[model samples]
Target chain A: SITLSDSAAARVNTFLANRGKGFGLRLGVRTSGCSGMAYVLEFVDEPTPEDIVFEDKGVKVVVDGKSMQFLDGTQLDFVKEGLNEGFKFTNPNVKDE
Target chain B: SITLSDSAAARVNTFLANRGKGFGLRLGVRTSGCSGMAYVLEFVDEPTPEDIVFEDKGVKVVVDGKSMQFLDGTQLDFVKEGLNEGFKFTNPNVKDE
Candidate 1:
């Protein structure tokens, strides 16, 4: 199961404030990137039965079972430093450059 | 028909130089993000039968047919402005905030 830092959870809350929508953030991966997989994160409008949901600090994170193998034990972080700001993923399965 | 800027092509080439491998770059998308989808990019080790390959400025861009709907007419650009450097996607279909 993937977890999110406090900052990441706060940012997620901010994005959903105005919409009054979205089930939670969805985390998945596709077959692409220098390391063969790239992260995919987005708001979940309607989560079906196939989605795997995890709760961390009151935040519901969604993921497809197919993506679990590569994402297990990962922690999602929102980093903001100077000019760079985005979601930084920490996955133990990937040996990326 | 997606395309890539010269800077992007050059950058892609540089990444593949050391490997002396990889057919080209792969572009696709996965479900996630506030907008329902996110851009995915990576070096293509082997273009599969299902992948739709395109040539732009001597660079091969591999993409799956499923992702072509959202990526059509997209131009991939490698940008360097002041202190930032990364791929700046020019997609006509997306109205991202």
Candidate 2:
């Protein structure tokens, strides 16, 4: 299971509204680095088949099967910080234990 | 003329080495936001004939003529600040005076 911080929820809601309409956020991991995985984020204009939807607070998060184990116990966050201002990941599987 | 900052050159080189075997970087603009345009960046595995190539430092930058007006006289820099580690642009055509 995954979740979004309250701040992340607010940020997503605000961005969706600002961008007009969107199905929600699509989150996933792809084979791309030393971890052999990297996060992927994009706005879902509409739902496509094969998309697994998870609702966090009021924001809809879309995922796929391949990324489940890799992202289990993860908390999605949005940081408006001056330097690294965007989505952030907090995943047990992705961090050093 | 479009150029790449030294830091951007080093960053791109490092990324390319990490990524392995890429043609170059593709920079473009698309209809996005109220600005009516948004920056696009992607690694090119192969350059199609349509790509108008620009050499910056030792890196090959592929852009289309259509994006020229939007990206002309621009200097692309890569920033690795605490959280926001990615590319930045300095385009005379893109900002307010």
Candidate 3:
């Protein structure tokens, strides 16, 4: 399971409210990118049969079992800088670029 | 300082896509909860002078120096199952049930 920051949650909530759809955000990782792995995120319209869900700060996030190992200790947040924006992660154990 | 699974990053990205605001996720731990410590997450409007920011999977996660020790090895994940959903944590040092 992962953690969500208050500000990140607030941003997600705002999005959910405006969209009027989506249960919450989904987070995980994949073996790609020059660094050997990269992060993946999506909005969950609903959970699949094998999905595992965790709730933090009223945001419902979903992840699959296969990806649990790599994503074990991670945090999700939303950040905004002037006109720039996006979600960010803070992970421990990944030392490469 | 941390790692994120591809899937977890995906979910957060989706939220960002729809919301069209935010930079990344902020992750940390706090001295609360029934267990002596709890996790804290939030969105960063911008990088603060004392903020320690780390990027993973296109997402930027921020953590203050004071909170780094407790959250050094934490992971953030999103999950959905049955009727539940949210972010979850898998910390190595935090064990006590």
Candidate 4:
């Protein structure tokens, strides 16, 4: 399953408030980029049965079955690098070396 | 040139807080999709001289020189549609008809 850092959880809560309603935040992936995959972040109002949900830092993080393989053991965090600020995924499944 | 709805401003503030620090939010356009252009959103730590900044609802929205023409009069808003929640751009320059 996936987890969210303290900052990431707080960010999701804020997005939920701005949205007014949502069951949780969904994390998925699609084929794109030179790396062959791209992260998909969305708000989940009603998760499907095939969705795997994880609770971390008081926030619901849902992921689809297909995305589970690549996202397992991934930790999501909010960070600012240079001028860009957004969610950063740290996946143990990925091998840089 | 561009504007943010109350909710969009609030969301940007939340993102800024989550990132711990940022100067403002940036909006731009790129060639993509079936349409000729697509919206590009980013967080700004230090804006360039060519960046045109707009203050709306206590938030700074920075748009680059080239993107200013296409983004003029665009109103950014945070909304939830069904299970999706995110920023939506309403561009007056776009003619659906």
Candidate 5:
């Protein structure tokens, strides 16, 4: 299972509202970087039947089953630093953890 | 003059579009952390006479006179790492630089 921060949920809602039409946020990952993986986020206009869903803080987060192995226990965060603002992931599966 | 990367400019424009109204971005810094300073950014809906303006990559950046000293020669960057995304500052004033 994954978790969503209050800030993350708020940001998703705000982005969805701004976008005007989105069923939820699609979360996944792909092979990239020297670390061997990277995260992916996008708006879900049409959900697939195979998609796994989690509702946290009133926001629905969609994830593909395959990505859950690397994403389990991952906490989504919205960070605002200086002029920067974006979603961050804290995953327990990382070696540093 | 501070610099803005292509990625940074693109994200700023996206934010402005989502926000629906804004003159530009207001950037500054305050004393914080052990490093003794941190960056500040906000949307500019109104203009002030003392505000210093810089136009780069077709985006307007507003800064106060005092903040410009430490911010000079700095570059604004937007980074997407794994699940993290945000603007970053590369300042020549930093010890590492």
Candidate 6:
């Protein structure tokens, strides 16, 4: 149920080439910060036993089984700023506190 | 320009909720490690004058103009592992040495 926008796919390919090694991006979640939950993203060199993999824009994304509960419907993106830069995530299941 | 996956957006939203404040994620690049660039990911409180914003999966991502060239075709993602968690990037412009 995951989708990748055209621009997002292009970014993935660029990073893959730069890293020189990686099967695809892996999406997941964790417990952290004051809210007891945090997002986890990484380059997967290989798939694991409990991974839930999704392919988009010619790229493969793997999500661990356990973390999937918290990240079932999530989106990932890249952004840039004058002095700060990084990846961003958006989820609908969360509620404002 | 940059893009984001549906699942990736979900993850960002979860993080935004956990953090308690943020318009979206900001994807960008930095000079670090052995390589000339290191991936930078973080939460943004608001849009800046020079921020290039990309919206996907109901979330907004801001990217800076200077870093856009380096991240033109990059993909962002999330992942989880035992006690470790974070976001990953894939770029096709890079070549392995």
What DockQ do the predictions score, one after another?
A: 0.03, 0.05, 0.02, 0.11, 0.30, 0.04
What lDDT score goes with residue B9 in model 4? 77
- The list of candidate 2 runs beyond 4 A from truth reads A1-97, B33-35
lDDT score for candidate 2 against the true structure: 0.75
CA lDDT of A13 in candidate 4? Answer: 77
lDDT (tens digit, per residue) of candidate 2 on A34-78: 434567777787666777788889988888766666667788886
Rank the models by TM-score, top first.
5, 4, 2, 1, 3, 6
* Standalone chain B TM-score for every prediction: 0.84, 0.85, 0.81, 0.84, 0.88, 0.78
Q: List the residue pairs that clash in candidate 4.
A: none
In candidate 6 the C-alpha lDDT for residue A38 amounts to 66
Displacement of the residue A65 alpha carbon in candidate 4, Å: 1.5
Clashes of each: 5, 2, 76, 0, 0, 59
Candidate of highest DockQ: 5
lDDT of 4 by residue, B37-84 (tens): 678887788889999888888888888987787788899887632223
Residue-level lDDT tens digits of model 6 in B1-97: 3666555666667667766867887887887535456777777888789888887667787889777777888877655321123466776776564
Question: How does each model score on lDDT?
Answer: 0.76, 0.75, 0.65, 0.78, 0.78, 0.69
Compare candidates 5 and 6 on lDDT and give the better one: 5
Superior by TM-score: candidate 1 or candidate 5: 5
TM-score of candidate 2 versus the correct structure, residues matched by position: 0.50
> Candidate 6, after superposition: displacement of residue A70 in Å?
1.0
In candidate 1, position A81 carries an lDDT of 27
Q: Write the per-residue lDDT of candidate 5 for residues B19-79, one digit (tens) a residue.
A: 7787888888988635457688788987688888888987788888877888988898888
Estimate the TM-score of every prediction. 0.49, 0.50, 0.46, 0.51, 0.54, 0.46
Per-residue lDDT, model 3, residue A61, is: 86
Candidate 3 local lDDT, B7-87, one digit each (tens): 678888787788777877777653331112345666766777767888889888887765554456667766654443666
Q: If the candidates were sorted by their DockQ against the true structure, best first, what order would they fall in?
A: 5, 4, 2, 6, 1, 3
Candidate 2, residue A78: lDDT: 68
Cand. 6 Cα-lDDT: 0.69
In Å, residue A97's CA in model 4 sits off its true spot by 8.0
Order by lDDT, highest first: 5, 4, 1, 2, 6, 3
Q: Is candidate 2 or candidate 6 better by lDDT?
A: 2
